[PDB]
Design a protein around this ligand. Structure first.
Ligand code: SF4
Ligand code: SF4
Ligand code: SF4
Ligand code: FCO
Ligand SMILES: [Ca+2]
Ligand SMILES: [Ca+2]
Ligand SMILES: [Ca+2]
Ligand SMILES: [Cl-]
Ligand code: NI
Ligand SMILES: [S]
Lengths: 279, 489
C-alpha cells in the first residue's frame, strides 16, 4: 500500500485548488492523506515552518528523486526577475539569507520530479493572474517549461477551481501507471495536456437544458425558466464533465444555479468574458 | 545579545508570509511582517464589464471567496442603482454565512491546531519543532495529556468532514464552492425551494452540533491549559468593524454592528477616515500622505527603496487597527455562548456574560481563538434564524443595466475582518477598482511614520525562551488567521 509522494507548491494561487481538494469524497481527504498520498510539503497545512519546512521539502525531493509528484497551484510570475512571488528564504553554510522565487523553485524541483501536475487553470494555462492588465509576466507551467527547456512529464488538471474528482482521479491514474505502466497506461490528454477522462465532454452537448435551447426557450433572467445562453452561459465552448458529475458531492452546479463561465479552458478568463454576455 | 529569527514560509496561514523577529532576554523586541506574492487584481479588473468583477475578485482567495463576492455585488448594487429584495438579502446571507462556519473551522483546526495538538507520525503532521510545547508536553499527568491530545486530534480529523459539509451548504444556493456562481448584481441567481432549504438545514444542524458540543469545549479547555497565552500577543488594542450580515433591507442593522475602538474609546465607523500608506510597501503613490481608497492607486514597484512588503498599510485616523472576530466581538459585545459562560466559570473561575467581560484576556493569542469560536456559535444562531425567515419561491433577483458612469462601495466583514470593495465605472467599464481587505489591516508593514502593523506590534513581548523552537511567534501570527492572498490581491 505504497503512497504517492507529493510536494505541493503554490505560486500566484488563491489556495482554492487546495480547498477544493479538501472537499473530496470517495475517497475523502482523511483517506487521501493517510492511505493514498504522502503529502510531504504543503504550505497551507503542514506542521513545520520556515527553515524546517524547506529543508524537509528539499530532503524529500532528494530522497525521492524521480519518484515524487510536483503539484503546482497558481501561476509563475516572470517579470522583475521573479520577485512578484517569493516562496521562502534559504540559509547557506555561513549564516546568510537568500530569497527563493517561484521561478527558481520550479526550475529546481521539476527536474527532480517523477511528473509535474499543474492543478487549476492558473498553473495549467495562466488563468486570472495572467489575464489582461496584469504586469507580473504571469505564466503557466507549460509555458515556463518551454521557456526553460525543461522536459518533464506534465499533466494539466484545470478548473478554477478543479473538481476534487479531477485532481484525485488524475493523480491516482498517474501513480497507477508508474506502478504498472502496461496495465495502467497514462490517461490520454487533449492538445492542451488535460485528461480526456474529465475534459473530453462538451458541457453544452451534455447539458440537461439542451432541449430548452433547441426550442429557443431562454431564461429571461437568472430566476426564470429556460436555457442560460442569453445570460452568458459558456457551456457551448467549454469541455468538462460538470453536467454529469456536478459539484460539492452532487449538491449543485454552475449551469443549474447560474451560468458556466468556462473556467477549465485555456482562454479563461479573457476568452470567456464578459461572463454575463452571451457567446 | 539580540538574536534574529526569520520564518519564510510562515506556514499554516493562507498565502505567502514572512515573519522576522528580534529576540532579547527571552522576548520578541522587534518584528517585521512581509507579504511576498503579488497578482494585481485592481490592475487586471480595469476596462472590464463591471459585472465580471464578482467572479474575478473571488479568485483573490479560495478560502474566503464569498466575502469578496459579497463586497463586489454590493458595490455593483450601489453603482447600478438597484435594491435587493428581502429574499435576495437573506439568500446572500445563507450563502456567505455557511462559509463563515467553514472558514473558522478550517482555521482553528487545519491551520492553528498543529501548534497545540500532536498529530500522527506521518507527513504532513511531521516533521515539527522538537520542543513544540504541545498538549502532550504541557499536561504533566500523562494519561490526561494523551486523552486531551487525542480529544483535540479526533476533532481535527472530524472537522475535515464538517468543513466539507459547510461547502455543501454554500453550494446549495451558491452553485459550487470554492468560487460561487449564485451572487450577482441585483441579488441571487437561484430562488430557494422548500426542499433545498430543508437540505441546507439538515446539514447545518450537524455543523451546529459540532460547534456547540466539540469546538467550543475544545477552545475553552485549550485556553485553560495555556493560560499564559491569554497574557501575551497583545498589540495596539485598536479594532475596527464595518458591519456584516444585514438584517433588514436598508442595511441599517447587522448581526455584528460597525464601530471603532481606539485607545479605550468607542466611536462610530466613518469610511472617510480610512486611508492607505505605502512608505514600506512595494507601491508608488502619486501624492504623499496616504490615499483614501476612493482615489487608491495600484502601481507596483518591487524596487522601491526601504519597502519590504506587497501589503499596503491601512490606518484609521492615522492609527493601526486590527480586524477579525476579536474586532467584531469587541465592538458588538454580544452575550457569550452558554458553553462559554459555563466553562469560563468551571475551568477558570471567571464570571462572564458578555464578550467584553473577558477584559484584557480578549487582546491576546488565546483571546483571538476564543473570539473566533464564540463568533462561530453566534453566526450559527443567526443562520438557524435565517433558515426560518427565508421564503421558498420568493424572488431573489432584480434586473439592472450597466451605468455609463457611477461609483459604488460594498462594505462587509470577511471571516478574517473588515472588507470593502470600491468600484468606479466610466463608459460602462471598470475605471478603478480598489480593495481594502481584512488581513490587509492585520498583516501590513510599517506606515510612513514607522508605526508597526497590528501583527508586528502584537509580536512585541511574545516569549521566546527557546530560540530554536520559537513556537509562540507562529502561535501569535496564526491567532490572527492571516490570508496573504487577500492582504495583497
Ligand atoms: S485555478 Fe482558480 S482556484 Fe486554483 S489557484 Fe488559480 S485562481 Fe485559485
Ligand atoms: S444552459 Fe448553457 S450549456 Fe446548457 S443548453 Fe443552455 S447554453 Fe448550453
Ligand atoms: S460548469 Fe463551467 S464554470 Fe462551472 S466548474 Fe464546470 S467548467 Fe467551470
Ligand atoms: N476572510 C477573509 Fe479574506 C482575508 N483576509 C478577505 O477579505
Ligand atoms: Ca534550461
Ligand atoms: Ca527585494
Ligand atoms: Ca488594495
Ligand atoms: Cl465534491
Ligand atoms: Ni482570504
Ligand atoms: S467568506
Amino acid at each position: 500500500a505504497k503512497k504517492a509522494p507529493v510536494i505541493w507548491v503554490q505560486g500566484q494561487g488563491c489556495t482554492g485548488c487546495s480547498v477544493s481538494l479538501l472537499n473530496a469524497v470517495h475517497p475523502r481527504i482523511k483517506e487521501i492523506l493517510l492511505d493514498v498520498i504522502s503529502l510531504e510539503f504543503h504550505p497551507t497545512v503542514m506542521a513545520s515552518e520556515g527553515e524546517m519546512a524547506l529543508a524537509h521539502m528539499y530532503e524529500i525531493a532528494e530522497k525521492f528523486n524521480g519518484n515524487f509528484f510536483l503539484l503546482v497551484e497558481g501561476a509563475i510570475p516572470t517579470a522583475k526577475e521573479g520577485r512578484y512571488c517569493i516562496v521562502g528564504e534559504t540559509l547557506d553554510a555561513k549564516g546568510h539569507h537568500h530569497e527563493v522565487t517561484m521561478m527558481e523553485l520550479i526550475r529546481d524541483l521539476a527536474p527532480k520530479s517523477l511528473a509535474t501536475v499543474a492543478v487549476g487553470t492558473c498553473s495549467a494555462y495562466g488563468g486570472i493572474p495572467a489575464a489582461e492588465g496584469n504586469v507580473t509576466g504571469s505564466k503557466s507551467v507549460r509555458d515556463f517549461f518551454a521557456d526553460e527547456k525543461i522536459e518533464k512529464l506534465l499533466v494539466n488538471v484545470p478548473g478554477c477551481p478543479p473538481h476534487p474528482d479531477w485532481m484525485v482521479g488524475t493523480l491516482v491514474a498517474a501513480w497507477s501507471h508508474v506502478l504498472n505502466p502496461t496495465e495502467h497506461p497514462l490517461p490520454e490528454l487533449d492538445d492542451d495536456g488535460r485528461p480526456l477522462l474529465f475534459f473530453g465532454d462538451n458541457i453544452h452537448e451534455n447539458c440537461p437544458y439542451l432541449d430548452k435551447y433547441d426550442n429557443s426557450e431562454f431564461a429571461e433572467t437568472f430566476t426564470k425558466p429556460g436555457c442560460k445562453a442569453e445570460l452568458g452561459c459558456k457551456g457551448p465552448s467549454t469541455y468538462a464533465d460538470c453536467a454529469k458529475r456536478r459539484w460539492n458531492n452532487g449538491i449543485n452546479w454552475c449551469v443549474e444555479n447560474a451560468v458556466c463561465i468556462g473556467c477549465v479552458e485555456p482562454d479563461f478568463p479573457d476568452g470567456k468574458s464578459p461572463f454575463y454576455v452571451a457567446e | 545579545g539580540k538574536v534574529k529569527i526569520s520564518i519564510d514560509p510562515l506556514t499554516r496561514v493562507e498565502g505567502h508570509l514572512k515573519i522576522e523577529v528580534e529576540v532579547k532576554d527571552g522576548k520578541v523586541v522587534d518584528a517585521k511582517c512581509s507579504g511576498g506574492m503579488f497578482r494585481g487584481f485592481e490592475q487586471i479588473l480595469r476596462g472590464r464589464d463591471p459585472r465580471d468583477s464578482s467572479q474575478i475578485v473571488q479568485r483573490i482567495c479560495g478560502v474566503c471567496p464569498t466575502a469578496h463576492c459579497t463586497a463586489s455585488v454590493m458595490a455593483q448594487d450601489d453603482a447600478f442603482g438597484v435594491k435587493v429584495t428581502t429574499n435576495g438579502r437573506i439568500t446572500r446571507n445563507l450563502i456567505f454565512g455557511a462559509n463563515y462556519l467553514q472558514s473558522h473551522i478550517l482555521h482553528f483546526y487545519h491551520l492553528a491546531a498543529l501548534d497545540y495538538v500532536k498529530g500522527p507520525d506521518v507527513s504532513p503532521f511531521v516533521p515539527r519543532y522538537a520542543n513544540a510545547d504541545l498538549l502532550t508536553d504541557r499536561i504533566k499527568d500523562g494519561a490526561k495529556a494523551d486523552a486531551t491530545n487525542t480529544y483535540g486530534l479526533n476533532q481535527y480529523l472530524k472537522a475535515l468532514e464538517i468543513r466539507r459539509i459547510c461547502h455543501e451548504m454554500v453550494a446549495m444556493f451558491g452553485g459550487r464552492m470554492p468560487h460561487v456562481q449564485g451572487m450577482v448584481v441585483g441579488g441571487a441567481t437561484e430562488i430557494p425551494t422548500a426542499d433545498k432549504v430543508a437540505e441546507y438545514a439538515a446539514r447545518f444542524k450537524e455543523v451546529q452540533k459540532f460547534v456547540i458540543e466539540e469546538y467550543l469545549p475544545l477552545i475553552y479547555t485549550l485556553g485553560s491549559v495555556y493560560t499564559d497565552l491569554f497574557e501575551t500577543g497583545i498589540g495596539w488594542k485598536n479594532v475596527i468593524a464595518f458591519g456584516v450580515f444585514p438584517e433588514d433591507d436598508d442595511y441599517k442593522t447587522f448581526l455584528l454592528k460597525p464601530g471603532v475602538y481606539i485607545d479605550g474609546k468607542d466611536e462610530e465607523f466613518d469610511s472617510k477616515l480610512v486611508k492607505e500608506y505605502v512608505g514600506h510597501s512595494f507601491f508608488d503613490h502619486s501624492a504623499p500622505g496616504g490615499l483614501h481608497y476612493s482615489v487608491g492607486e495600484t502601481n507596483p514597484n518591487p524596487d522601491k527603496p526601504g519597502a519590504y512588503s506587497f501589503v499596503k498599510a491601512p490606518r484609521y485616523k492615522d492609527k493601526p487597527c486590527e480586524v477579525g472576530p476579536l474586532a467584531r466581538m469587541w465592538v458588538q459585545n454580544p452575550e457569550l455562548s452558554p458553553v462559554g459562560q459555563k466553562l469560563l466559570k468551571e475551568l477558570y473561575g471567571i464570571e462572564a456574560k458578555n464578550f467584553r467581560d473577558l477584559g484584557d484576556k480578549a487582546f491576546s493569542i488565546m483571546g483571538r481563538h476564543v473570539a473566533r469560536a464564540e463568533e462561530t456559535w453566534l453566526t450559527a444562531v443567526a443562520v438557524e434564524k435565517w433558515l426560518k425567515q427565508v421564503q421558498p419561491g420568493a424572488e431573489t433577483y432584480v434586473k439592472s443595466e450597466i451605468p455609463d458612469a457611477a461609483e459604488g462601495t460594498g462594505f462587509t466583514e470577511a471571516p478574517r475582518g473588515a472588507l470593502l470593495h470600491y468600484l468606479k465605472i466610466k463608459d460602462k467599464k471598470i475605471e478603478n477598482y480598489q480593495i481594502v481587505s481584512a488581513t490587509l489591516w492585520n498583516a501590513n508593514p510599517r506606515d510612513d511614520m514607522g508605526q508597526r502593523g497590528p501583527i508586528e506590534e502584537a509580536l512585541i513581548g511574545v516569549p521566546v525562551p527557546d530560540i530554536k523552537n520559537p513556537v509562540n511567534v507562529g502561535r501569535l501570527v496564526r491567532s490572527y488567521d492571516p490570508x496573504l492572498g487577500c492582504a495583497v490581491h
